[PDB]
Design a protein around this ligand. Structure first.
Ligand SMILES: [Mg+2]
Ligand SMILES: [Mg+2]
Lengths: 428, 67, 428, 67
């Protein structure tokens, strides 16, 4: 009965004025879906690459014609008269139309837009909410927001070598208090940085970017702001890092060049530095602590700390049906990094989360550092019981669209909505 | 009036004192400069006003949807 | 819109002539649910006990009046005008009506009947299949049947000390071939046992019960039947055991009395015996290998074999919100045993499976050795991706109702239905 | 007829030979003793007949639902 009659993509402008692609799916009965095609970055080679025009004269390589023609003239004639409540058949049909492994024929963005519009239309046809269409009836556990607070490294001009510092409010009863706590910690940190006499302007992903001297100064300032906000660190507010150690790894000699501290550390001294930082400050998660071509040091790191600090890895578990299952076998790291708009459909996302739940890992919903978003990721973070979402975005009107979409789920689950808190750290 | 303080999509206008009266803080959007939302302060000092300003940035008040 | 107007339980007779209790739930629009109240055993003390009349003059303690009055006069006046598509609110309301921990006020059977009738009515109202109401859209992976083949110990009069031997066809492409393989292995074993000149009558749970001499003779005969059926053991057809070591454990001295072999083994010799049986025969699962009061030997067993043989444990992880989380912390065993009609509602089942998926364990859907069934367990085994179901039943007309209910799911998932196979042994 | 062989809810009746003709095996239920289902044998020997008997027990043929 709910057969698809029209799949149609168009070009609209965002708040930034950049052109975005918008996929719509009509039915016979009048159900309606709508999803945004991402326009992000195409880093990596062993995963699904995103396809733009690449025209630097047209928005620095974010062209839309080759992304909208592939939807209107190839994908659309193969989806007439097809039933819309059959998500797995559509996700197999789109991959068979693509043909290659890295989705390089249609782009990994044009497939994801259709495969979420055809899942927002089926939730409109059945008159159930989208987090119950994707996840059953017992999908009621909102994730823990990872909220970028201080930038450094490539994103700023300062002597901070770690790229991103994050806070993770785990001592809150429900999601709304977990968001209010972060809203107060940002004000306390702006007060502290204005007391020191620094720049308090909002940087890239929402965090600040002051002129600091070392990593230890930043970890002093953030913990001092958490204490002045009124909360106890290590019990209610944890921290996290995104080290981005590939940026200061010199390949020719295999030594890490910490430009902030001016000290060249070898691959056995970085783990000794991370042990000191975990022993002094309440870090609970480290992202890309060592380069992915440093197996002799990475196997050391995953057992010196891997029982009390979460260690995620993106290119170590790069999103493919063969390469993500490679680092599972030798057992390095204890958490993987689900990136939805680099992974393809909605079937491969829920298989890649399940294969990480089996092998004892922990999924962290994330995104590449320049993509836009959409608002369906807040339903995938509830329906899969992922546990941690990374609420960063390149602009404020996408960040607030993450926040409101996760707050309009708790208001439907009124007497029922759980929250992880510290129970997401089961393997620590 | 006192400290209009234009922010991105809103204005946080503490009123005039309306002499011998405690001022109040209200959050207006760009249009409709006469409706006003009370953000549930306790004192309406300068520090409370800066708290409301830094709460309209980052996009969470408990009183308004903040699109 | 779909408000409940009538909850009503009655008494009907099965194929055995025993009285069974049948719960029905009506709606306003005309949706309809129907579930069977179990009438099993109440073993254990730290879990939810089932409540009958206990009258030995009325079907040896399977009375129905105290199970149908609790539904018709207590549970039913609290569920008028309530919305039927809200499963979590109903499962919290029933526990609040119960009050105690072991469900001993209403019985753990009268709550489960209502909490599955109110989930088969909601799947009828939304016009979706029941394995998608409970599990999302990506619930497509049928479990591996564990099929009881040779009984021993308490269930028969022979010198076999292990209670139940099982076969697990893991080399099949889909579920229908996995059932056909077992259908041929039973014929080959009946041929072998008739060649030896033994009794080939069907025993308790569906398996045979011949007059054998030792455990090694049974493990020779089953492997010889697998080879004569045409299949390769260890690659396509595994085995399993249910040791039931509590039956021959003498408590006063702490020594195991193997009455079959006539040898009294201590707690360090049983693990040496299990290593020999795993090294000679393709056992992949051992159930209750040591008694639950033998921690000094059980901690030995869970590391001598726990990396290549699944070790389930029922009373070690007895179904409660506190006691099932006790054996997780010290880390004994690597699989738990979900028993649905001893655990209560449908919310606590899907939480107890999720808490086992987090801590690296493996769920095995099972049942107490004397309960009847219902046919909704075949939808819980698909919707949770449990992986192993135990298709035994006290009578044939319940066993075939398990088989047909798992075959009418593969015929709806026609081009989509997965199968575990050997991929369910991820922690080995 | 040849080897009626009453089983639980069914009968597996190999026919009479219908002279100079190969016999066939059919599975009937308790009523309706004239419909017949072919279980896709290859030879209809005694061993094939025993295979069909032990397949009606345990409850799986590929040809009938077997309630
Ligand atoms: Mg991180
Ligand atoms: Mg990132």
């Amino acid at each position: 009965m709910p057969y698809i009659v029209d799949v149609y993509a168009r070009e609209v402008l965002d708040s930034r004025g950049n052109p975005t692609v918008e996929v719509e799916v009509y039915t016979e009965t009048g159900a309606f879906g709508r999803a945004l095609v991402p326009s992000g970055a195409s880093t990596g080679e062993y995963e699904a690459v995103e396809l733009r025009d690449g025209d630097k004269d047209r928005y620095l390589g974010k062209g839309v014609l080759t992304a909208v023609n592939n939807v209107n003239e190839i994908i659309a004639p193969e989806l007439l008269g097809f039933d819309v409540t059959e998500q797995n058949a559509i996700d197999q049909l789109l991959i068979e139309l693509d043909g290659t492994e890295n989705k390089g024929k249609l782009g990994a963005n044009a497939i994801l837009g259709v495969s979420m519009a055809c899942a927002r239309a089926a939730a409109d046809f059945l008159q159930i909410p989208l987090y119950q269409y994707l996840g059953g009836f017992n999908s009621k556990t909102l994730p823990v927001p990872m909220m970028n607070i201080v930038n450094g490294g490539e994103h700023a001009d300062n002597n901070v070598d770690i790229q991103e510092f994050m806070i993770m409010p785990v001592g809150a009863p429900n999601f709304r208090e977990a968001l209010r706590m972060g809203a107060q910690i940002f004000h306390s940190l702006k007060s502290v940085l204005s007391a020191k006499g620094l720049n308090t302007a909002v940087g890239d992903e929402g965090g600040f970017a002051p002129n600091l001297g070392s990593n230890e100064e930043a970890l002093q300032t953030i913990v001092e702001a958490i204490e002045k906000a009124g909360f106890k660190p290590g019990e209610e507010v944890k921290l996290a890092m995104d080290a981005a150690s590939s940026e200061f790894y010199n390949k020719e000699d295999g030594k890490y060049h910490l430009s902030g501290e001016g000290v060249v550390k070898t691959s056995a001294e970085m783990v000794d530095w991370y042990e000191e930082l975990v022993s002094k400050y309440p870090i609970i998660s480290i992202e890309d602590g060592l380069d992915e071509n440093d197996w002799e040091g990475h196997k050391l790191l995953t057992e010196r700390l891997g029982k009390k600090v979460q260690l995620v890895g993106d290119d170590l578990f790069v999103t493919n049906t063969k390469k993500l299952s490679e680092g599972i076998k030798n057992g390095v790291g204890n958490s993987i990094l689900i990136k939805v708009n680099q992974i393809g459909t909605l079937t491969e996302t829920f298989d890649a989360i399940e294969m990480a739940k089996r092998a004892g890992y922990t999924a962290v919903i994330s995104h590449r550092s320049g993509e836009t978003e959409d608002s369906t990721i807040a339903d995938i973070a509830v329906a899969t019981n992922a546990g941690q979402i990374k609420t960063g975005a390149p602009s404020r009107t996408d960040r607030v669209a993450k926040y409101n979409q996760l707050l309009r789920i708790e208001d439907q689950l009124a007497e029922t909505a759980q929250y992880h808190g510290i129970n997401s750290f089961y393997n620590l | 009036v006192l400290r209009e303080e234009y922010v991105e999509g809103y204005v946080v206008q503490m009123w005039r004192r309306n002499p011998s009266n405690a001022p109040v803080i209200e959050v207006f959007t760009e249009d409709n400069l006469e409706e006003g939302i009370i953000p549930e302060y306790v004192t309406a000092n300068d520090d409370t006003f800066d708290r409301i300003v830094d709460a309209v940035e980052f996009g969470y008040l408990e009183e308004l949807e903040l699109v």
